[PDB]
Swiss-Prot record, chain A:
Organism of this sequence: Homo sapiens
Name recorded for this polypeptide: DNA-directed RNA polymerase II subunit RPB1
Name of encoding gene: POLR2A
Superkingdom of the source species: Eukaryota
Function statement: Catalytic core component of RNA polymerase II (Pol II), a DNA-dependent RNA polymerase which synthesizes mRNA precursors and many functional non-coding RNAs using the four ribonucleoside triphosphates as substrates. Pol II-mediated transcription cycle proceeds through transcription initiation, transcription elongation and transcription termination stages. RNA-dependent RNA polymerase that catalyzes the extension of a non-coding RNA (ncRNA) at the 3'-end using the four ribonucleoside triphosphates as substrates. An internal ncRNA sequence near the 3'-end serves as a template in a single-round Pol II-mediated RNA polymerization reaction. May decrease the stability of ncRNAs that repress Pol II-mediated gene transcription.
Subcellular location per the Swiss-Prot or TrEMBL entry: Nucleus; Cytoplasm; Chromosome
UniProt family annotation: Belongs to the RNA polymerase beta' chain family.
Pathological association: Neurodevelopmental disorder with hypotonia and variable intellectual and behavioral abnormalities: An autosomal dominant neurodevelopmental disorder characterized by profound infantile-onset hypotonia, developmental delay with poor speech, delayed walking, and impaired intellectual development. Additional variable features include feeding difficulties, dysmorphic features, and visual defects.
Binding positions (DNA template strand): R1
Positions that bind DNA nontemplate strand: R6
Origin organism lineage: Eukaryota, Metazoa, Chordata, Craniata, Vertebrata
Swiss-Prot record, chain B:
Disease: Trichothiodystrophy 6, non-photosensitive: A form of trichothiodystrophy, a disease characterized by sulfur-deficient brittle hair and multisystem variable abnormalities. The spectrum of clinical features varies from mild disease with only hair involvement to severe disease with cutaneous, neurologic and profound developmental defects. Ichthyosis, intellectual and developmental disabilities, decreased fertility, abnormal characteristics at birth, ocular abnormalities, short stature, and infections are common manifestations.
Protein name: Transcription initiation factor IIE subunit beta
Localization (cell): Nucleus
Annotated family: Belongs to the TFIIE beta subunit family.
Function: Recruits TFIIH to the initiation complex and stimulates the RNA polymerase II C-terminal domain kinase and DNA-dependent ATPase activities of TFIIH. Both TFIIH and TFIIE are required for promoter clearance by RNA polymerase.
Superkingdom field: Eukaryota
GO MF, any single term: RNA polymerase II general transcription initiation factor activity
Subunit structure: Tetramer of two alpha and two beta chains. Interacts with FACT subunit SUPT16H. Interacts with ATF7IP. Interacts with SND1. Part of TBP-based Pol II pre-initiation complex (PIC), in which Pol II core assembles with general transcription factors and other specific initiation factors including GTF2E1, GTF2E2, GTF2F1, GTF2F2, TCEA1, ERCC2, ERCC3, GTF2H2, GTF2H3, GTF2H4, GTF2H5, GTF2A1, GTF2A2, GTF2B and TBP; this large multi-subunit PIC complex mediates DNA unwinding and targets Pol II core to the transcription start site where the first phosphodiester bond forms.
Upper lineage: Eukaryota, Metazoa, Chordata, Craniata, Vertebrata
Gene expressing this chain: GTF2E2
Included range, full protein: 75 to 239 of 291
GO BP terms in the entry: transcription by RNA polymerase II; transcription initiation at RNA polymerase II promoter
UniProt organism field: Homo sapiens
Swiss-Prot record, chain C:
PTM annotation (Phosphoserine): residues: S126
Species of origin: Homo sapiens (Human)
Functional description taken from the UniProt entry: TFIIF is a general transcription initiation factor that binds to RNA polymerase II and helps to recruit it to the initiation complex in collaboration with TFIIB.
Gene label: GTF2F2
Family indicated by similarity: Belongs to the TFIIF beta subunit family.
Chief localisation class: nucleus
Keyword Nucleotide-binding appears in the UniProt entry: no
Name of the protein in its database record: General transcription factor IIF subunit 2
Binding-site positions, DNA: G211, H213
Assigned keywords, A-Z: Acetylation, DNA-binding, Nucleus, Phosphoprotein, Transcription, Transcription regulation
PANTHER family assigned: GENERAL TRANSCRIPTION FACTOR IIF SUBUNIT 2
GO BP terms, alphabetized: positive regulation of transcription by RNA polymerase II; transcription by RNA polymerase II; transcription elongation by RNA polymerase II; transcription initiation at RNA polymerase II promoter
Sites bearing N-acetylalanine, chain numbering: A1
InterPro entries in UniProt: TFIIF_beta (IPR003196), TFIIF_beta_HTH (IPR040450), TFIIF_beta_N (IPR040504), TFIIF_interaction (IPR011039), WH-like_DNA-bd_sf (IPR036388), WH_DNA-bd_sf (IPR036390)
Length: 50, 165, 222
DNA sequence: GAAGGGCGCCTATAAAAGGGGGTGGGGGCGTTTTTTTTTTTTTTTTTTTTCGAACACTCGAGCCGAGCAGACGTGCCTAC
């Protein structure tokens, strides 16, 4: 849990794994941008996964 | 003490009646119906209630005027008001009525001259006070006024900035 | 306080006494004698390397208890007395402890079991009920409530108010006892409507409150 | 005393008028304290496999810098 979150991947991926609210609060607070490049973000969003 | 309060109350009524003429203790005992209060209490009266009394007025070798000592002029505080720093004095309506004459008769004339009534000693209670310059703009006034409470809502040194630009 | 003095005569005489364990049932049989004289006799039999001590009951009171001696080398025991006259004395010293062993064995037990019946037997649940309804034997006018109305039925619900000046006298009298009073004490003291008394306290006094609405009134002593 | 009988008050309705009283309705003070020393108990304390670190915090400790003081060195005044 505490290692996967150090990865420079988009915030929405990290929410999909155990951290839920907390990673989103920090993502909102820093104002990071999620490039929808990975498998999970695309499936959650509903558009055809890469 | 209770007996002494009846002396105070009698004296209070007499002041209220308009007179402050002094009387002997014996007469006061009589008029208060406390003649048979005994030598001891009388002596207590003489050597405390009448002499250790912080606001007793001795005049004509007799004791007068107990209820009041703070005010004697029995008139509007023109001197108190004239000052620009020590101005003032919200006072109790019952104090003004007790001091000399009932307020209401002078007040009906005074109500558009020198007196102002605010509800403050409870909403039933009334305080007396006074005024000076006009209102600024004829208008419904209460409607415009209620749309003018400014904006005590921030970014206001910036709303004057914005307003100046 | 001489009452707190402990007499040492006994101790200084080196008076010795015996300490014996005997069953409550043996002492209950002894209680029938009621101190009229004796409860029986004690016998001591000594042989080549043995001592046999026993007590035997009076033939009369009955109309062998062997003794077992215990060690007292590891403790000191003394007897001190407490008089009804509020005086304390060490009457003497315990030199020996012992226990009284019952001669009868297994049938004694029946007596014991009978004794067990005597100590242990208030009925526990036990007989149930076959009956049911009794309750609410109709008061139609509740019995306490009737009594309270009866108390009311002796000149109540009317107050002086009306005698103003005499009521003022009560106020003046009361105020002579203390500088301030609770409204509730004045209501008990003058037996009049509260609102009227308030108009009087407005007339000749002020009020002074503290804590949780705890109010006391005073005729402004000076 | 136990029991049955006879006498008398009880509730409803009415309807009014003065005054005491009650159940409110609402607001207040948020107490402090009197103690009863309390239902706020130990859930399960654990039955444990317990962390699983990460992060913050604690408290102490040691190197390093400035100032101070004496020893070493220099600067200043007096006598032949």
């Amino acid at each position: 849990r505490h290692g996967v979150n150090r990865q420079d991947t988009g915030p929405l991926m990290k929410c999909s794994f155990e951290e839920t609210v907390d990673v989103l609060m920090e993502a909102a607070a820093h104002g990071e941008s999620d490039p929808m490049k990975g498998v999970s973000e695309n499936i959650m969003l509903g558009q055809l996964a890469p | 003490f209770g007996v002494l309060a009846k002396i105070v109350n009698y004296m209070k009524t007499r002041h209220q009646r308009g007179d402050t003429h002094p009387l002997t203790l014996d007469e006061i005992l009589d008029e208060t119906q406390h003649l048979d209060i005994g030598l001891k209490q009388k002596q207590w009266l003489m050597t405390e209630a009448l002499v250790n009394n912080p606001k007793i007025e001795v005049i004509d070798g007799k004791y007068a005027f107990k209820p009041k000592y703070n005010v004697r002029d029995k008139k509007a505080l023109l001197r108190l008001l004239d000052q620009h720093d020590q101005r003032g004095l919200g006072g109790i309506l019952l104090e003004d009525i007790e001091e000399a004459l009932p307020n209401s008769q002078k007040a009906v004339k005074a109500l558009g001259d020198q007196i102002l009534f605010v509800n403050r000693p409870d909403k039933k209670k009334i305080l007396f006070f006074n005024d000076k310059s006009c209102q600024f703009s004829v208008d419904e006034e209460f409607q415009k006024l209620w749309r003018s409470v400014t904006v005590d809502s921030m970014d206001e040194e910036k709303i004057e900035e914005y307003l100046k630009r | 306080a001489e009452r707190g003095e402990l007499d040492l005569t006994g101790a200084k005489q080196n008076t010795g006494v015996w300490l014996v364990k005997v069953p409550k049932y043996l002492s209950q049989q002894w209680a029938k004698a009621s101190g009229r004289g004796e409860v029986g006799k004690l016998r001591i039999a000594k042989t080549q390397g043995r001592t046999e001590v026993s007590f035997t009951l009076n033939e009369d009171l009955a109309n062998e208890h062997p003794f077992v001696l215990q060690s007292v080398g590891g403790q000191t025991l003394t007897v001190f007395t407490e008089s009804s006259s509020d005086k304390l004395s060490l009457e003497g010293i315990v030199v020996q402890r012992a226990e009284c062993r019952p001669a009868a064995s297994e049938n004694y037990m029946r007596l014991k079991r009978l004794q067990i019946e005597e100590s242990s037997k208030p009925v526990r649940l036990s007989q149930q009920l076959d009956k049911v309804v009794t309750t609410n034997y109709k008061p139609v006018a509740n019995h306490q409530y009737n009594i309270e109305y009866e108390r009311k039925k002796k000149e109540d619900g009317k107050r002086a108010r009306a005698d103003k000046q005499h009521v003022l006298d009560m106020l003046f009298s009361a105020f002579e006892k203390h500088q301030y009073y609770n409204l509730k004490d004045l209501v008990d003291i003058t037996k009049q409507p509260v609102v009227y008394l308030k108009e009087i306290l407005k007339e000749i006094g002020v009020q002074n409150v503290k804590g949780i609405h705890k109010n006391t009134w005073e005729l402004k002593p000076e």
